Scaffold this motif. Structure first.
Motif: not given
Ligand code: SF4
Ligand code: SF4
Ligand code: SF4
Ligand code: SF4
Ligand code: FES
Ligand code: MG
Ligand code: ZN
Lengths: 96, 54, 115, 86, 690, 125, 117, 208, 48
Positions: E34-37, E45-50, E64
């Motif tokens: 995670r980065f934005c959660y 929901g912006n980073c998209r790493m999840c 997330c």
């Protein structure tokens, strides 16, 4: 940029100098206090500011792989200069 | 050395040029690589006899 | 039951017998130790030190712990008899170069933070 | 001899502290307005037992158990404490 | 009941409806990248790493923000999930600057660690990177925007937790930037938390810059004493020195944040410290001396006087151990003139009942109330984490908030009734619409601040507030155990002092001026030498040089809260203990040890010799002080109301005014924060932008 | 055969530890708190045992940090709290135990960001 | 490639190369390096303490591999025996003096090996 | 997958699994577990009472013939009720194979000496006793091997401090070497290196 | 160095020094950091 203290002790680049009261000055009796003569802050203050014609400039410290990691500097603030966080060199855009 | 920067450090030019190389150099020289859990006994033919590590 | 196995002794009586045998051996050995190592202490001091070392753990009620303590004492006696030990090792029992550490509250308060 | 403070240690929901709880719920206010300048500190015990503490001049104090006492018993012993007896 | 079944890697999990994929995964111990959660912030929901792959679904989902569905089989370690992670990490690192050796985040960076754990090991980016210009948002948070990954965590925290809408984004696509778009300092009592929430070195602590690396620090877990909230913290030390203060999660209390005074005033400890005993010489000047000499002088002057002549005052940062030791020592001299600077009404029940002076509802209980009334309080500055909890309930539970007092800005919209204390009587008598509002509320809360009990008519005010609570309990009946009555403290030592039997206030000194005074960290300036007879002996025990030190005859250096294992009682009534991080500087000692040694010198030696014995004594005096997380206690509101309705002193025709009206008067309140240079910089920044 | 001891386990006399570092020490049994600078939770899974912090002073030469207690760096790892308690008790050390702190589950709703009448609506993304 | 007495290096302008990243301190197998740092008066990231205990050092050269800016090196000097123990506890001034003293050879040695690194 | 990844030998893995099943079948009284690692190493977990029979069988059986004791050591895991793990590493020259035998003990329970089975074990057992404090019954001559004379404690235990409790120096007043409590000019600096993000999903533990 | 001179720098020593151990020019180590804790300075004027 070494300046002397009231006791005659040289002041280091870091600024450490023993106080008159301190007993640790005895270690320098019949010996010397090692001080480097080339203050890097004064040396880097002497470098001229480069003028470039782009909003973003790149610095690697010179010498290619013999310098620091390559970083990019923004030069949008007109009333300031961009400084490399590794080298300390300054860049700007031509004003006035 | 093995071409796996999560174990072996990258070259200096790569570390000074690309983000991933710098991150991996930083982590390998500060924390080091993690080794999966387990136990081994490895032995070689050393000049004085069998030399082993458990 | 607690299902434990012994080392040598079954109960505390056999352990006490082993302790007495070890004490006899050390008490016999002290004069020879004073002679061979050229110690400046007297035989009385050595026997008092042996008694103090024995009394240091007189509160043990586990026969296994007593058994291991007797084994360690026999190891130390074997080191002393064979002269593997040196004069410094024998004299470490007396702590001759350590300044006394006070135990009352006021002195500890004066010197430092340690409780 | 000169009483300075009164401390009662009663637990919140122990069966033995029921009497002290009842006393505090019923008759504590009367005692408080009878002695408007006497500290009566109500504090809470853990599972051990109830207690009552009485402090006198120059740092002297003794404690009396209130285990299984009824409200009448605790009132009795408390007013023995607040008079020159025991 | 309504639980549904989902599978994480073939393992069945029963979860509540509306549970997201990330939460279902962590139900079995798998943490999704995670980065934005952030679990305490709105989903972005912006980073998209999840992104993870759901079985039999061609498209990856954002764990997330996607609710799990019945029969779903998440695949957290499939090829599609791993490739999604690698691509997202590559995009994240494409424009990131090669700043790790000069970045303060290095060694504790989420970007670094997740690149090592889920990304590739090399780059194929062959272009030039972007570079954005830096922003100035105050003297506390250092900004290096080129490192920003556009998580938008800071914007969401500022809007939702701090209630400040100064942060946002300008521009679009690659050019989009996070900032204020103008020169404006993001100044808030909780502003320093954006450093913690920011996963990269874009936002960093300015006082902390360049001083340490995370692998170097030794972590000590202790309690914050800068207010009565008792926030759980971690003290980072290296080679015998305090390096920084970090929040430590405690759900009931602070949860994940600390106030800016809690975070940045630690630098105060470094300067203006008492390190050696001091006495007065022939010229009336303070002169360094040994412990023995000062203790002998104090013991002689203590043996010289008895009873009422001896007196003491406890400051705002005193622990329970030292308080009980001083109380015992003065009781041996037959003195009862043991007082605190903070005033609490003594009429009726007074300190006899614990419930009378505590926040009965508790910090976590704010999340259940629907009406809260605040009287003469400025919660934002007095108890910033309590105000944060109130705002959280306002945002998530539609909590209705009304204030009686001056219209301070609380970062959320409240209903202003007024500042004249007559409104209290109007509400009590039922002649107010807000009386009807409280009558209809299922879980009402009334909170009276301790800063309004400082006035001459404060005791009357307590009775009026109590009358309101009795009316609520009468008309609305008994909801069981709700504890409408509450008191909000602002001093860390107040509740423990009240528990110990210390006399609240300082009027006993004024009516019986003593000849031997003990100043236990008392720096409030409540009593000068004018209020005392001349040639009076004043003894100061503390850790700083402030209001109370230059007026004393003997100085005994003590330990700060970072240098001892001490007991502090929360406004709620919870008792928590600190731990030793660094030993006291110079010759300073533990406070209870100083008092016990003095008692030994004076001849009236105290029974306890170790800290455990002092805590046994504390248990003897008040057993709640050794239960180190308990907060549940009996309620005696009925008896207190009975004993409070028998005295009828009149109110005052002066509008209630909080001591700290604005943000500037928040930074410097006690001895430590007055010696902090960071707090001085913050005051200068708020009084003038420049 | 067996001997069936009925005492309490006590190995202090066999460990060689000096008497001072047995009776005057207080160990802490706790699960370390998550480092607030990172979101990872892999360092909050085990129990830790550490000793009380003692004095550190500045070296007259070089100004390094000096210590006199040998247990200033000792940290143990345990699977459960009971194992740590058993170890501390059999080694003779007095201890304090802190119960494990777990983040309580939360109710997240992405649709709540755009609510029609609630205060949860977000002004910006 | 010979590993000798340690030195601290400068950029051609005279500014120090070391930026107090503490990678050398982290990687040192003997814990022979002690570092303290703070922002310089001009805002630069620089050290205030850089000590190497030469009676702790194993002369492995890990510190110069870990350094990302070639600030710390093992120079070619090997004849630096002393008459007292305290002369082998180097501080930052001593290391900077060694760098200024041996740079003419250190730079040539680095030029001859950096393509293997 | 080809260049940087170590190759796996399936044939060896099959042979070691079959031999482990064989040994477990022949000695059910002592074998608690048999394991083969993915890098081809076979482990056998036994009850402490079976130290002598298992080692003797593995040395003397025609199908075993592990006539050489490669290594014997201990591992300390303080979280376990039985603190100490005893590891035997055996090598078979006849069949060109290696095997590992494991058992457990605590501070107060002795383990039978394996000196009768292997001559090589005499020194290894002495080292285990010196470093860990595990007592071996019926040892020909059990005493310290590595530590200084009169040394107190067992330094390989996790609880024992890295720098110990005492140091040595020469004292001129008593004209000998004396032992005193350790004092350090520079304290060893403890590092916290572990990443808060999990590295290896294949080893994840159930959340209890 | 005659055929291949080294690079000239403003900070390189112009005068080489040999091993000065055992002489008055010998290196003596010292701490290069400043004071950590500042003490409180009592006032210089009387109080009564
Ligand atoms: S924030 Fe960026 S520059 Fe700083 S350590 Fe992390 S990855 Fe490196
Ligand atoms: S400053 Fe930090 S929290 Fe804010 S958007 Fe950038 S990376 Fe995210
Ligand atoms: S050469 Fe090796 S031991 Fe010496 S300072 Fe460098 S890293 Fe440390
Ligand atoms: S010498 Fe190099 S590795 Fe060491 S702190 Fe300085 S820049 Fe970092
Ligand atoms: S954590 Fe889900 S998109 Fe960022
Ligand atoms: Mg950050
Ligand atoms: Zn540069």
């Amino acid at each position: 940029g070494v300046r002397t203290s009231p006791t005659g002790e040289k002041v280091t680049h870091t600024g450490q100098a023993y106080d008159d009261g301190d007993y640790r000055r005895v270690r320098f009796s019949d010996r010397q206090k090692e001080v480097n003569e080339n203050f890097a802050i004064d040396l880097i203050a002497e470098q001229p500011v480069s003028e470039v014609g782009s909003r973003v400039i790149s610095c690697d410290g010179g010498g290619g792989a013999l310098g620091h990691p390559r970083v990019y500097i923004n030069l949008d603030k007109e009333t300031k200069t961009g400084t490399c966080g590794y080298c300390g060199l300054q860049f700007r855009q031509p004003h006035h | 050395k093995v071409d796996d920067a999560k174990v072996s450090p990258p070259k200096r030019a790569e570390m000074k040029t690309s983000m991933e190389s710098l991150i991996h150099h930083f982590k390998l020289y500060t924390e080091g690589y993690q080794v999966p859990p387990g136990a081994t006994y490895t032995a070689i033919e050393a000049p004085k006899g069998e030399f082993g590590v458990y | 039951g607690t299902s434990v196995k012994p080392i040598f002794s079954r109960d505390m009586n056999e352990a006490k017998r082993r302790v007495r045998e070890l004490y006899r051996a050390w008490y016999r050995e002290v004069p020879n130790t004073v002679h061979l190592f050229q110690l400046d202490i007297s035989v009385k001091q050595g026997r008092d030190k042996v008694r103090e070392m024995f009394m240091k753990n007189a509160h043990v009620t586990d026969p296994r712990v007593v058994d291991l303590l007797v084994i360690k004492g026999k190891m130390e006696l074997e080191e002393t008899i064979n002269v593997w030990k040196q004069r410094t090792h024998i004299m470490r029992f007396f702590h001759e170069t350590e300044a006394p550490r006070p135990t009352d509250f006021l002195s500890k308060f004066y010197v430092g933070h340690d409780p | 001899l000169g009483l300075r403070e009164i401390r009662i240690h009663l637990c919140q929901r122990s069966p033995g502290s029921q009497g002290v709880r009842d006393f505090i719920e019923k008759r504590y206010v009367e005692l408080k307005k009878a002695n408007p300048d006497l500290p009566i500190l109500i504090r809470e015990c853990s599972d051990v037992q109830p207690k009552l503490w009485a402090r006198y001049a120059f740092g002297q104090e003794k404690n009396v158990s209130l285990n299984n006492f009824s409200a009448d018993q605790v009132t009795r012993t408390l007013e023995n404490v607040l008079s020159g007896k025991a | 009941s309504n639980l549904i079944e989902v599978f994480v890697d073939g393992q069945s999990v029963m979860v509540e409806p509306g549970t997201t994929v990330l939460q279902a995964c962590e139900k079995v111990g798998m943490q999704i990248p995670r980065f934005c959660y952030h679990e305490r912030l709105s989903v972005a929901g912006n980073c998209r790493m999840c992104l993870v792959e759901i079985e039999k679904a061609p498209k990856v989902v954002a764990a997330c923000a996607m609710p799990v569905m019945k029969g779903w089989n998440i695949l957290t370690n499939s090829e599609k999930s791993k490739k999604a992670r690698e691509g997202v990490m590559e995009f994240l690192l494409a424009n990131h600057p090669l700043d790790c050796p000069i970045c303060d985040q290095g060694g504790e960076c989420d970007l670094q660690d997740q690149s090592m754990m889920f990304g590739s090991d090399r780059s194929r980016f062959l272009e030039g990177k972007r570079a954005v210009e830096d922003k100035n948002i105050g003297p506390l948070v250092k900004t290096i925007m080129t490192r920003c990954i556009q998580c938008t965590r800071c914007i969401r925290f500022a809007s939702e937790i701090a209630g400040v809408d100064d942060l946002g984004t300008t521009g679009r696509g690659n050019d989009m930037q996070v900032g204020t778009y103008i020169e404006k300092m993001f100044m808030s009592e909780l502003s320093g938390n954006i450093i913690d929430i920011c996963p990269v070195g874009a936002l960093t602590s300015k006082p902390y810059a360049f001083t340490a690396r995370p692998w170097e620090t030794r972590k000590t877990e202790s309690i914050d004493v800068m207010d009565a909230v008792g926030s759980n913290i971690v003290v980072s030390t290296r080679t015998g020195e305090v390096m920084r203060i970090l929040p430590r999660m405690h759900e009931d209390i602070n949860e994940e944040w600390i106030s800016d005074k809690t975070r940045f005033a630690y630098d105060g400890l470094k300067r203006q410290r008492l390190t050696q005993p001091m006495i007065r010489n022939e010229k009336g000047l303070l002169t360094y001396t040994t412990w023995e000499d000062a203790l002998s002088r104090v013991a002689g002057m203590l043996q010289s006087f008895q009873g009422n002549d001896v007196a003491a005052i406890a400051g705002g940062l005193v622990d329970a151990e030292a308080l009980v030791a001083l109380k015992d020592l003065l009781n041996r001299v037959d003195s009862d003139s043991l007082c605190t600077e903070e005033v609490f009404p003594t009429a009726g029940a007074g300190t006899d009942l614990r419930s009378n002076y505590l926040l009965n509802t508790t910090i976590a209980g704010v999340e259940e109330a629907d009406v809260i009334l605040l009287v003469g309080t400025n919660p934002r500055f007095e108890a910033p984490l309590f105000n944060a909890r109130i705002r959280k309930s306002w945002l998530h539970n539609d909590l209705k908030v009304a204030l009686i007092g001056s219209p301070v800005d609380l970062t959320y919209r409240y209903d202003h009734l007024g500042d004249s204390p007559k409104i209290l009587q109007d509400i009590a008598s039922g002649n107010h619409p807000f009386s009807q509002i409280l009558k209809e509320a299922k879980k009402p809360m009334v909170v009276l601040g301790s800063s309004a009990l400082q006035r001459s008519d404060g005791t009357a005010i307590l009775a009026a507030v109590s009358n309101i609570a009795q009316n609520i309990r009468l008309s609305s009946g008994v909801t069981g155990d709700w504890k409408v009555m509450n008191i909000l403290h602002r001093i860390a030592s107040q509740v423990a002092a009240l528990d110990l039997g210390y006399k609240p206030g300082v009027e006993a000194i004024r009516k019986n001026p003593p000849k031997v005074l003990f100043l236990l960290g008392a720096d409030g300036g409540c009593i000068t030498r004018q209020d005392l007879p001349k040639d009076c002996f004043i003894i100061y025990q503390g850790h700083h040089g402030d209001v109370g030190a230059p007026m004393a005859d003997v100085i005994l250096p003590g330990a700060a809260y970072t240098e001892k294992s001490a007991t502090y009682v929360n406004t709620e009534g919870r008792a928590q203990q600190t731990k030793v991080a660094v030993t006291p500087p110079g010759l300073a000692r533990e406070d209870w040890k100083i008092i016990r040694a003095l008692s030994e010198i004076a001849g009236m030696t105290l029974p306890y010799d170790t800290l455990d014995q002092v805590r046994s004594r504390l248990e003897e005096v008040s057993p709640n002080l050794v239960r180190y997380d308990d907060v549940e206690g009996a309620n005696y509101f009925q008896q207190a109301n009975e004993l409070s309705k028998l005295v009828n002193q009149q109110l005052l025709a002066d509008p209630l005014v909080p001591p700290q009206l604005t943000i500037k008067d928040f930074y410097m309140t006690d001895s430590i924060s007055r010696a902090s240079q960071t707090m001085a910089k913050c005051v200068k920044a708020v009084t003038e932008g420049i | 055969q067996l001997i069936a001891v009925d005492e309490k386990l006590d190995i202090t006399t066999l460990t060689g530890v000096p008497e001072e570092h047995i009776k005057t020490r207080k160990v802490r049994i706790f699960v370390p708190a998550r480092n607030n600078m990172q979101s990872g939770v892999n360092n909050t899974k085990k129990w830790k045992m550490e000793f009380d912090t003692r004095e550190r002073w500045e070296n007259p030469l070089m100004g390094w940090s000096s210590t006199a207690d040998p247990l200033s760096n000792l940290v143990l790892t345990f699977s459960t709290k009971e194992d740590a308690v058993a170890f501390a008790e059999k080694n003779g050390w007095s201890f304090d135990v802190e119960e494990r702190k777990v983040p309580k589950p939360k109710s997240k709703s992405y649709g709540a960001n755009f609510s029609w009448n609630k205060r949860t609506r977000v002004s910006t993304k | 490639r010979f590993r000798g007495e340690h030195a601290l290096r400068r950029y051609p302008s005279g500014e120090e190369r070391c930026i107090a990243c503490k990678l050398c301190e982290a990687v040192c197998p003997a814990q022979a390096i002690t570092i303290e740092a703070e922002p310089r008066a001009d805002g630069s990231r620089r050290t205030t303490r850089y000590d190497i205990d030469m009676t702790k050092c194993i002369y492995c050269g890990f510190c110069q591999e870990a350094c990302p800016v070639d600030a710390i090196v093992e120079g070619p000097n090997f004849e630096f025996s002393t008459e007292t123990h305290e002369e082998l506890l180097y501080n930052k001034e001593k290391l900077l003096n060694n760098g200024d003293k041996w740079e003419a050879e250190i730079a040539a040695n680095i030029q001859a090996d950096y393509l293997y690194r | 997958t080809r260049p940087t990844i170590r190759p796996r030998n399936d044939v060896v893995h099959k042979q070691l699994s079959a031999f482990g099943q064989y040994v477990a079948e022949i000695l059910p009284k002592y074998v608690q577990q048999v394991q083969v690692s993915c890098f081809n190493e076979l482990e056998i977990f036994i009850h402490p009472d079976g130290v002598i029979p298992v080692l003797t069988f593995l040395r003397d059986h025609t199908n075993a013939q592990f006539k050489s004791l490669a290594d014997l050591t201990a591992v300390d895991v303080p979280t376990r009720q039985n603190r100490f793990e005893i590891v035997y590493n055996l090598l078979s020259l006849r069949f060109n194979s290696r095997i590992r035998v494991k058992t457990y003990t605590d501070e107060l329970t002795p383990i039978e000496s394996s000196v009768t089975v292997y001559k090589a074990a005499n020194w290894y057992e002495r080292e285990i006793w010196d470093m860990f404090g595990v007592f071996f019954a019926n040892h020909p001559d059990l005493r310290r091997i590595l530590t200084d004379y009169g040394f107190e404690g067992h330094p390989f235990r996790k609880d024992f401090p890295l720098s110990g409790y005492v140091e040595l120096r020469y004292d001129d007043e008593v004209k000998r070497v004396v032992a005193e409590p350790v004092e350090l000019a520079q304290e060893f600096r403890k590092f916290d290196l572990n990443s808060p993000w999990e590295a290896f999903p294949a080893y994840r533990q159930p959340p209890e | 160095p005659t055929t291949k001179p080294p690079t000239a720098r403003k900070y390189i020593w112009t005068n080489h020094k040999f091993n000065v151990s055992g002489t008055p020019q010998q290196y003596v180590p010292y701490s290069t950091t400043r004071k950590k804790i500042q003490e409180w300075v009592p006032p210089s004027t009387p109080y009564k």
